[PDB]
Scaffold this active site. Sequence first.
Site, mmCIF file in Angstrom:
data_model
loop_
_atom_site.group_PDB
_atom_site.id
_atom_site.type_symbol
_atom_site.label_atom_id
_atom_site.label_comp_id
_atom_site.label_asym_id
_atom_site.label_seq_id
_atom_site.Cartn_x
_atom_site.Cartn_y
_atom_site.Cartn_z
ATOM 1 N N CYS A 176 0.671 -1.053 0.155
ATOM 2 C CA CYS A 176 -0.110 0.057 -0.117
ATOM 3 C C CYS A 176 0.815 1.161 0.115
ATOM 4 C CB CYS A 176 -0.859 -0.206 1.281
ATOM 5 S SG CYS A 176 -2.133 -1.545 0.754
ATOM 6 N N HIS A 315 -3.229 8.527 5.686
ATOM 7 C CA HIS A 315 -3.171 7.100 5.251
ATOM 8 C C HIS A 315 -4.589 6.609 5.831
ATOM 9 C CE1 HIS A 315 -2.251 3.175 3.127
ATOM 10 N NE2 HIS A 315 -2.429 2.638 4.488
ATOM 11 N N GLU A 326 -1.416 6.158 13.484
ATOM 12 C CA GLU A 326 -1.068 7.398 12.448
ATOM 13 C C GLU A 326 -1.618 8.555 13.482
ATOM 14 O OE1 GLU A 326 -2.935 7.710 8.743
ATOM 15 O OE2 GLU A 326 -1.437 9.032 8.200
ATOM 16 N N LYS A 347 -10.252 7.962 2.029
ATOM 17 C CA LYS A 347 -10.466 6.512 1.615
ATOM 18 C C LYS A 347 -11.870 6.319 1.774
ATOM 19 C CE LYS A 347 -6.031 4.463 1.884
ATOM 20 N NZ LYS A 347 -4.994 5.591 2.341
ATOM 21 N N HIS A 352 -9.623 2.017 -0.521
ATOM 22 C CA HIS A 352 -8.212 1.953 -0.405
ATOM 23 C C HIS A 352 -7.912 1.433 -1.720
ATOM 24 C CE1 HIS A 352 -4.408 0.934 0.657
ATOM 25 N NE2 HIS A 352 -4.703 0.589 1.811
ATOM 26 N N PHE A 414 1.860 -3.082 4.300
ATOM 27 C CA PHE A 414 2.163 -4.613 4.875
ATOM 28 C C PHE A 414 3.642 -4.499 4.884
ATOM 29 C CE2 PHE A 414 -1.873 -7.108 4.196
ATOM 30 C CZ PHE A 414 -2.503 -6.395 4.918
#
Lengths: 426, 426
Positions: A176, A315, A326, A347, A352, A414
């Site tokens: 991502c 994000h 975050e 998002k 996403h 990830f």
Amino acid sequence: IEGRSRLHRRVVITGIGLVTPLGVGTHLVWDRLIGGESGIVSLVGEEYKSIPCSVAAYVPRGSDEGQFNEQNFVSKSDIKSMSSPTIMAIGAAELAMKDSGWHPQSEADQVATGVAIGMGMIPLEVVSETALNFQTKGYNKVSPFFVPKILVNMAAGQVSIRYKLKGPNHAVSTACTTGAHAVGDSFRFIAHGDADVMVAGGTDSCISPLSLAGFSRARALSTNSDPKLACRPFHPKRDGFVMGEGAAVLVLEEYEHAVQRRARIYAEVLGYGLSGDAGHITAPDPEGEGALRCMAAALKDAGVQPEEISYINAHATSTPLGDAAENKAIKHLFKDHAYALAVSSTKGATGHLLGAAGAVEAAFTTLACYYQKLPPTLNLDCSEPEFDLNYVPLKAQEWKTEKRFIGLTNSFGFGGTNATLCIAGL
Amino acid sequence: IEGRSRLHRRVVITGIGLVTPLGVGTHLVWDRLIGGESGIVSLVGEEYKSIPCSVAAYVPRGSDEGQFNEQNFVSKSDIKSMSSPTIMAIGAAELAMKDSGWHPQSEADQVATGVAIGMGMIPLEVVSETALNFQTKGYNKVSPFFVPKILVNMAAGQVSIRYKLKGPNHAVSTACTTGAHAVGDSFRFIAHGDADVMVAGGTDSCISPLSLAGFSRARALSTNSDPKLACRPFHPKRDGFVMGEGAAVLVLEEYEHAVQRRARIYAEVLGYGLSGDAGHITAPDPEGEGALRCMAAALKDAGVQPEEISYINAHATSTPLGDAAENKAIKHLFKDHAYALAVSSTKGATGHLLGAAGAVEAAFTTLACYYQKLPPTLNLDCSEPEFDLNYVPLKAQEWKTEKRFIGLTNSFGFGGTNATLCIAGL
Ligand SMILES: [N+]
Ligand SMILES: [N+]
């Protein structure tokens, strides 16, 4: 002896091409984003039976303005030989170059223009369908195009081939974080002198029963059956992300190059920061230490103090742990100034976009700089005490300043891979 | 508008870790390469009976010194959550860090060390086997580790987690150029100041009936049944590449940082060049224009004139068109100096390691600088008129003369993506 000094050139963004669940076309998408629209929908079909997630965000397909028509970009024969994310990337690249007015024809312009488009995941269904074909009907039934069709770098390759881009040809695949790395790497290449223009971005189009099963098994996806409510960054009821698809491409260009041809300049890329959590393969650092380090690195690259940041495109994908980490990182980095900036996650609108997320969000941050207007976080009707910042809830906000408008955009993936881009008005 | 001067630091290589068909371990693998050994063998397994290919190069596995024993690096439990290339990358990175004596413990040293490990293609069988499992045994039988196992960036992610490396975490995926880009990007990050150390390289381990079928249908592979002769770069009878597997990792380090801890330094990374053919999806430019341009860019980056190059580790994979095209690029760029340097391809020894190829060959070029000794091109007992250079045929050559020893290593990939690294003795 030791290191010398070299010229580090300035880099601006002169074009954007967006193929997204909000629609196709950068300015139409921005209008819809600012208007509070969303492309999240319910899954349809028995094939999604048994999977805990029942929502996704698709690029709308068709012939209407704002819809994606593959035939506008690639021929019927080309369709068979390239993957869906590659086709989306070619569309986004076409739109970005048209938006920029950059269509290299001379050998010199061709060699001065490179491509850095990443893809987060291989087209899983192309692999599984071919395996079945191979196992049942044999060797001769495998397409000679199979390998080039399935490679992550082939979005960048096909964009290079179709638009005659002969400069640096690079493709990252960092889950991502992909789209952010693509923009940042392009910035560095131009600043370094390897190219004067880069067509940069990210693509992913892999929504399928198998992929949704995989992400659900990793406990990453929202289990909410209501597509209006499923994705709600920073919200107390957040319960995982919503998988989207799309491509976002930005034309980055050396500053003098842009000025000399009288390009429209949206913003300047000031800085790029990278870090690794070195913690867990899917879970983020609960304290957000990696996020703090990549934001700080971006600020250092940019030569910008925390106090000078107006806006962060977070994000925040709508996960219990992710959004909290975050938020923590922002509060720990910016201290009292955290209450003086605005943060939002888009998002809720796009879903996403995986490998494209960091590029689409770099596009939205660029447009926020250009317009000094901030897109909302959808669905944020209330929040826990720990979420005490301005997340631009529900409705877009004007953000006028006489000082320079400077934004950050964050992308985490990830593997604990993190990146931030620092982008500023001109 | 034109930019600002910034410090551009020097970068050296202080460790090398190799997991290859020639064996495991730095100086062991170099000794075998220099001794003229090869890891190419006949394919074993009934699953390969239908495909035209009959040879490949495997990493030798076992507990002897020089063999790969996964259990030395990963637990039986962790194996299930990781792909074969990821495991090879972990082994290679551990060995590289051991070879460098870099085991960062302090917060400062951990944050200063990043990871840039790429992968060209995830093993296809993980996908097709999971698809079947999902279809026949249901959602709740899909491994929660499925998504991690199919992500290109997981090798960089796992290496970061396992050795607590918290700097830039980056994974490129540019087909056969991957390993070269990983080393170059690491070089640029350290020169730029993002990190003081990078664990850089590439991994691939995807030899399977379907993968080989794919490459065969693309008419890429040698159909020679003799593993002793199948791979013969520059040879009149060359007829396609031989697929290998493996990982190669290099520890790159800022020069003052290395001197201060009294590292043993193998070589200096001087330059990195990138280009795109913008031509064919799988074939290189027949006249090698793209190759010429990336080599020239690497020399420009390094600040080195063509006459200063003494050695080129060619990409040359043993293909009719590809080998001839690279040879043409070399002759066009170096002109009469082409006859003064030496060129060799080490793919006769390792096979084509795909995403690892550019990193293994960067390692070999680094060791060529350090030892001033050139590894041979195996099987080149004769050649066509056009191949008239010194290709170090058959036997290693000492190379102790002139001035500074400066090498190039080239890597080219599907999608026309090209990279060259310039690496020099110190
Ligand atoms: N973002
Ligand atoms: N090479």
